[PDB]
Structures are given as structure tokens and as C-alpha cells.
Amino acid sequence: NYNYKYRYLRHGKLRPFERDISNVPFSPDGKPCTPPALNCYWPLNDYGFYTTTGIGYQPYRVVVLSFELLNAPATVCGTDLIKNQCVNFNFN
Amino acid sequence: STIEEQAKTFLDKFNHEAEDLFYQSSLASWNYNTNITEENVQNMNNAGDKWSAFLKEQSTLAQMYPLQEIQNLTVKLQLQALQQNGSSVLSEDKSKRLNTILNTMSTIYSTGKVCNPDNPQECLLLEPGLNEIMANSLDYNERLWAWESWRSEVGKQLRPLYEEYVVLKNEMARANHYEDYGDYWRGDYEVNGVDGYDYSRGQLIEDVEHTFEEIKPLYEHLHAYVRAKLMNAYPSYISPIGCLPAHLLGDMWGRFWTNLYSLTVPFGQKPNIDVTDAMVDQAWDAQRIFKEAEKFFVSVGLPNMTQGFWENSMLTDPGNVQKAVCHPTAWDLGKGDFRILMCTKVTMDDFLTAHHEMGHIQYDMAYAAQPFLLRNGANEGFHEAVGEIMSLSAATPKHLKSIGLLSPDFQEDNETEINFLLKQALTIVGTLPFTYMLEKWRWMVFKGEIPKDQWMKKWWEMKREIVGVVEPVPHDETYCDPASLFHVSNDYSFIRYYTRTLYQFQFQEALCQAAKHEGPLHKCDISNSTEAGQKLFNMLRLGKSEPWTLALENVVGAKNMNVRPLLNYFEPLFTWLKDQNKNSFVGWSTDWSPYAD
């Protein structure tokens, strides 16, 4: 199942949360190419998952639970009922 | 940027495209050699042809880069692999002719059968049948018949093919800037650009002759002993001063002589270290044998395999419904998918073979961090050596004594000690002059030192002088029993087993130095001692990025092969051989012949 591709050629690191979509023919100093030109190949390739392979070559889905902090009011945050006892509240 | 970095960039493109293609190629080979079907033989080499065109394609695309401008040894050794022109560098007629000659030899060596001269119904191929008649049968005429007919049916057809093969292949090797195809073997041992760890090609012939000159007396005494015990086995058939006929040597040629041990045993009234019957009587299957071998690999500090091994590998022979080849082979399919194909029976030979191929996979798992063509041995001679290490350590009486076999109140006295010594010694001693002689023979024939009209004459004279082996019936040049040998007809070297045999006991003494063993080498079990496995891991993961001289010096401290550790393994047994060869002639004579007497 080669249909999850990894981007592996770009000039430099990605920025905080940078989502690189653009597929450009890549040469290691710019220089507009078109394959199969010399040092001019693709920035994308296939993972190569077969279930027959090793453990780290099995497909894992990753969610990144990204924290951005308090740029608006409370969005996600997070105590059973007690009876016949002097209890404290904070209801809805 | 600089040419070094786009050499890295292009080479990484090569490996990252190459990995899925080699994975599909090795899957094609696995699904062929685990179930032989016509779809498997068509699809086996189709993913191989797709791969072989890809490699010469990228070989043409990588040579344009400068070789002598790259500073990094690690990626210049990548360039040495891709700028290896290969065997496609000829006229396109002769390249396919050389490939067709190799395939024709590969076909008629394996499809060939012997037939009874009066009955054209009793016809028998090599495995099984002829490897079972040549090993343990006692009939003189039947061993001689199988021996000579295996040479008389196919070697006569294998002679013109090898006759054309030597000229075509040495023409290829000269086109690749080598002396001959033996020099193409030695160029794999050649390493360049390291300043001190390098290797010249004539050093292989030099150093093999170096160690062979002192194998000669050890092999001389053991050959005299097994000649005397074959005189005990075969009356009026072997002269006491002479050589040994090649139909009495356990195998078809004279390579392995461990099959003589049942008739060349020192001490016939002692419990044998061979625990095959103990493995059967303690009720093991294939799974328990591989689990016990895995337990020893955990004991020497080495991890388990991937889940794909215990998931997908053929650990048991399926039989008639799913036919499969039964050579024990360590399959390295790429993408970390590591398997062992072996029609596993309950045998200490199969137990040590489980250790052997699991050590091969262990070698593979150590170089699992390397890039693609670097994912191999440092040389071709440390792969089989690392495989043989765990078999040599896992054959000791201390090992099988606490495996669960070989009851643990067992005496380590000199009787069964020299018994196990001589049992391993028939192997180690019989394999050296055959390998010396066979590689010297092929260096002679490939270089041109034997004329082509004297291959079989000089062949058996080298068997009589070097190996000390006569032919029982004469051989003209119509035969070619070297072409009727396995490792010659299929375009392979054989000196890796010579180097294996030396560096095996080198590594064994170095690991038992790490194991802090005190006596001679044979009592040494490296189980529970992780220093031995760690000292093996000090060389196990470098590969071809550094020379095999460097990986050899990291463990035993040398840049060259040496005759000392094998002789130190055999030295109390050598005193025993000196104790035994007083009543037989010490040597062999080339003038004897069971056809000329």
C-alpha cells in the first residue's frame, strides 16, 4: 500500500506546522527541471508497506494533538455525585 | 552544490527506488523457492529482470559522476559498486551467450541423472539418491558406480560449456580491468582509499598458500589416519601409503569428509556428542529446534528476529502438496523481512544449521542500518564465518549438555574430547585442501595456467598431490568434473569457505577470550557470556564501508589470514594424531590409482 507518500526533498526544514503540498521538480539548488533530468527527480516517494515486513515498516496512523494555548475561551477541559453528605458544587 | 552532495543525493535516489524493486525481486524468489509453480518460475525472474535492467540503467547513470573527486570513503565505496560495470560490458552477442552458457550449465548439472547400464528404469539424480549412496553405503561397486556415472552423464556435456565459459567470462573480467574471473573474485576482497586497511589482489593467492603450507602436515596426519580407518572399512581397496579414492570420501568429490567419522571414529565405545538421536528421543519438532537456537542467540546477547520470520517463514517441509526446495537458506527479502527456508528435520546437524542460518540473519540484522549495497558482508568471507561461529560454539559438550540434551553429569575427559575434535576435524581438515586445490585450479584455468586440453588431467593430479585423492577410474578431457561441481558451474567463487575456515577459529578464539575460557577452544560455550556476542557485534555491523581487514582487526587483531587458531584448535588432537599415525605411513602418493593397480 504505497498510497501514503512522504515528501523528502525540500530546501530546508519545515516551519512550525508547515503543510507542504506543492509538488515541484527538485534540483538541489533550485534550477527548474523535468524528470528524468540529471539531479532532477521527485520530492515524493512511496513508503512500502506490506504486512509481511518488519514492525517499524508497518503502517501506523499518527494523530498529532496540537496545543495552541488560550487564544480564545475554553474549548476542551475536564466527579461522581455524592448523596447525603455535605458536598461542594460547581454545576453547569 | 558540490559533486559529493549530488553524488549522495543521486545515490540516495538509487537506494530508495532500489529498495522496493529488490523487495519485489526477493519476494518473487521466495514465492518461487517455497512453491515451485510455472507462475512462480515466470514471475521469479520477471521481478529479477525488472531489477537487473534497473541496476545497469543506474550504473550507466552513476558513472558520469567523478569517482576520483569524492572525499568521503563511505559514498565513494557506493560509487565503486555502481561504477562496477558488471557482466553486461561486452558485445551484446557474447554477454547473452555467457548468460546462456551459465544457464545451460545450471540446468544440466541439476537435471542430470545416472542410469543402470542394463536397466533403463533405475535412474537416480543427485539429491537424494546419490548423496545417500556416496555417503553411507559400503558397496565398493555401488559407490564407484554412482561416483563415476554422475561424472559420465553430465560432465561430458558440461565440458564444452565450461570450455566456452572460461574464455567468455575471462573476456568479461578483462573488460572489467581484472586479470581473470579469479581476479574478479579477488577484487571483491580488494578495498581502496583507506590508507592502511587496503587490499591487493595477489595477496589472496599469497595468503591462501601461506596458511595452506601448514595445513599440509595436519591434513597429512589426518589423511593418514582416515586412510588407515578406511583400510579398516574397505579391505584391499586402499593402499596404505597412497591416496584415497574419491568414491570413498563421503561426498562426490572430496570436499567434505565428516561422513568418514562413523568409520574413522577414535573411540568406538564412548557416548557420542552428536545428540540427533537425543533430539528425536526428547520429542522435538522444527519449532522447538528453532526456539532452542533462538534461546542460545538470546544467551549470547542477540535479539529475536522480526515478527515476519515467525509469521511467514516456512519452518516445516509441506511435502507433496506444496513442494519446496530443501536447501537451508537465509532469505533477506528487504524491508526488514527476514526469513529462513529449511525443510527442518530433528537433527543436531539441523540444530547447528538453525544456529547457522539464524547467525546469517543475525549478521543481516546487524547491517540493517547500512545503505543498500553496503548491506552485505565486509567481504564475501565473513558472512559464512559469522554463520559458522554459533554452530562451532553450539556444538560443544557444555552447550548441548545444558540445552536439555546430553545428561549434565557428563565427563569432559580426553576420550570424548578427542572424539568430538576428530568429528569436527574431518570437516575442517577435509575442506581445506579441496578448497585450496579448487580455487587454485580455477585461478589456473581462468588465468590460463592450465591449458584447456589438460583440465581433467591436471585436475586429478592436483587432487592426488594437493588433496591427496586419486580417481578410481581414469578421466580424459571428455569429462569436466569441475564443471560437474556445484560452485563452479553457477558463476560463484569458493575461496570464501577457505577464509571462513580460518577466520572461524580466529573469531572463536577471540570470542572465547571474551568468554574468559581457560582451556583449549572446544570446551568453550559462549552462552550466558555476552562479552563474546558483543565482541562479535563490534565487527558485525560495519560492513563494506570499512575494509574486512578492519573488521578482522577489531576482533582478532590482524589484517590477514593466519594458520595459528585452527592449529591451536587441533593441537591436542594433533598430539593424538601423532600418537595414532605411528603405525601407518604419514602422507599420500600420487602414483597410486584404483584403475592402474
UniProtKB/Swiss-Prot annotation, chain A:
- Cystine bridges: which residues? C33-C40
Q: Could you say what the effect of mutating N3D is?
A: In strain: Isolate Shanghai LY
Recorded consequence of changing L38P: In strain: Isolate GD03
Give the start-end ranges of region Receptor-binding motif: 1-60
What does changing F67Y do?
Answer: In strain: Isolate GD01
Q: What does this protein do?
A: Attaches the virion to the cell membrane by interacting with host receptor, initiating the infection. Binding to human ACE2 and CLEC4M/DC-SIGNR receptors and internalization of the virus into the endosomes of the host cell induces conformational changes in the S glycoprotein. Proteolysis by cathepsin CTSL may unmask the fusion peptide of S2 and activate membrane fusion within endosomes.
Protein name listed in UniProt: Spike protein S1
Protein's organism? Severe acute respiratory syndrome coronavirus (SARS-CoV)
Shown residues in whole-protein numbering: 435 to 530 of 1255
From Swiss-Prot, chain B:
Q: What is the effect of changing R339A?
A: Strongly inhibits interaction with SARS-CoV spike glycoprotein
PTM comment text: N-glycosylation on Asn-72 may limit SARS infectivity.
Effect noted on mutating E19A: No effect on interaction with SARS-CoV spike glycoprotein
Look up what happens after changing A7V: Increases slightly the interaction with RBD domain of SARS-CoV-2 spike protein
Entry EC number(s): 3.4.17.23, 3.4.17.-
Sequence positions that bind Zn(2+): H356, H360, E384
Q: Name one GO cellular component term.
A: extracellular region
Q: Which GO molecular function annotation, any one, does this entry have?
A: identical protein binding
Q: Tell me what the record says results from R174D.
A: No effect on interaction with SARS-CoV spike glycoprotein
- Positions bound to substrate: R255, H327, P328, Y497
Q: What is the effect of changing R496Q?
A: About 50% loss of angiotensin I cleavage but two-fold greater activity with angiotensin II
Q: What is the effect of changing H327A?
A: Complete loss of enzyme activity
According to its UniProt record, which residues of this chain constitute the active site? E357, H487
Please give the catalytic activity noted in the UniProt record: angiotensin II + H2O = angiotensin-(1-7) + L-phenylalanine; angiotensin I + H2O = angiotensin-(1-9) + L-leucine; bradykinin(1-8) + H2O = bradykinin(1-7) + L-phenylalanine; neurotensin + H2O = neurotensin-(1-12) + L-leucine
Query: Where are the residues of the annotated region Interaction with SARS-CoV spike glycoprotein?
Result: 12-23, 64-66, 335-339
- What is the biotechnology note for this entry, i.e. how is it used? An engeneered stable, dimeric and secreted receptor with combined mutations that increase the affinity for human coronavirus SARS-CoV-2 spike protein shows potent SARS-CoV and SARS-CoV-2 neutralization in vitro.
Impact after mutating N312Y: Increases slightly the interaction with RBD domain of SARS-CoV-2 spike protein. In sACE2.v2.2; increases interaction with RBD domain of SARS-CoV-2 spike protein
Domain comment as written in the entry: The extracellular region of the ACE2 enzyme is composed of two domains. The first is a zinc metallopeptidase domain (residues 19-611). The second domain is located at the C-terminus (residues 612-740) and is 48% identical to human collectrin.
Q: What is this protein called?
A: Angiotensin-converting enzyme 2
Organism this protein belongs to: Homo sapiens (Human)
From which residue to which, out of the full length, is covered?
19 to 615 of 805
